[PDB]
């Protein structure tokens, strides 16, 4: 569950899972993609065309052939995609809104690989070399749990849990309530520049968005808006 720091984007979770079963193919369940994409396709989309270079991100010791023959089966799987661009077309061909032109699809699969998956490592212009390391670490840690070299994580361990006190509980509200009022001052600048007159904000600032969203959720207990309280 990757999250940045109280961003207006919520948490966004990858999944680098491995299939039951050739056998032993690793997939990836990126966000904003409906199907799943094998991982070497992602490492090529992030921009690593060579095969040794994906593997240096996944396997730090090339000297134990124990973990080499575990990622071969997925390395043979995507031998059909070899450059970055057909690789983006693979992921971009799967979105929620798949673009009708190819170029729309690569603009999609380049935007989800820079802001939707793994944001905490970075959402900048060039962070693929460290989203690549942190992805290869997720695969590597999966291969350790499958080779049996490391015990699986316990969902109940309190080290794996955070408590949301009255601070984040409220900064989760005050983001949505502060986006609603920028949607209000938007429409109010709109109905007013289009008459070509000039627009004023004192009347555009709807004060009853904060003052009443807070007071509502703190009164009923429903942590949301009143329109979607069930």
């Amino acid at each position: 569950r990757s999250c940045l720091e109280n961003s207006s984007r919520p948490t966004s979770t990858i999944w680098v899972s491995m299939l039951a079963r050739i056998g032993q193919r690793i997939v990836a369940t990126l966000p904003y993609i409906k199907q799943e994409v094998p991982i070497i396709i992602v490492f090529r989309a992030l921009g690593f065309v060579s095969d040794r270079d994906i593997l240096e991100h996944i396997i730090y010791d090339f000297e134990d052939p124990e973990m080499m023959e575990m990622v071969k089966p997925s390395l043979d799987e995507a031998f059909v995609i070899q450059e970055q661009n057909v690789a983006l077309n693979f992921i971009g061909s799967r979105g929620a809104k798949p673009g009708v032109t190819k170029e729309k699809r690569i603009k999609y699969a380049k935007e989800v690989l820079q802001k939707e998956m793994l944001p905490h490592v970075g959402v900048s212009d060039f962070c693929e070399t460290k989203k690549a390391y942190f992805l290869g670490y997720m695969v590597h840690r999966l291969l350790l749990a499958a080779l049996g070299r490391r015990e699986l994580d316990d969902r109940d361990h309190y080290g794996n849990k955070r408590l949301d006190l009255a601070g984040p509980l409220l900064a989760f509200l005050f983001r949505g309530m502060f986006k609603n009022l920028l949607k209000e001052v938007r429409i109010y600048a709109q109905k007013f520049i289009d008459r070509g007159k000039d627009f004023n904000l004192e009347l555009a600032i709807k004060t009853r968005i904060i003052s009443d969203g807070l007071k509502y959720s703190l009164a009923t207990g429903n942590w949301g808006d009143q329109k979607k309280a069930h």
Binding site: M68, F79, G148
Partner: protein, 116 residues
Amino acid sequence: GFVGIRFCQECNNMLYPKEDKENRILLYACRNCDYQQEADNSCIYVNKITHEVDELTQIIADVSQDPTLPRTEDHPCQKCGHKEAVFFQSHSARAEDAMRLYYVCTAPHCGHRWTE
């Protein structure tokens, strides 16, 4: 033993094993490249169904500075001859049936590990 991935030399991609159907030899050609290099292992895929693993290969020597790990003075090292040693069980998932102990010398620059 095993086989590793042996990578191409031109494109640094993975070489497949391919039998040379004329001279009767085993090659490794590429998919992206046309690189043929001549094999030597004459073994392609191996598979340990027993999954026989030696744990002494996985033990790092850095365990000896673990405050939370029991210490004996009844098994001394063999390279150095220190008296202190830490000991632990396989500490691995997939431990088949063994509660065997492993020792590490608790003396820096040694990290000798052994099993009794």
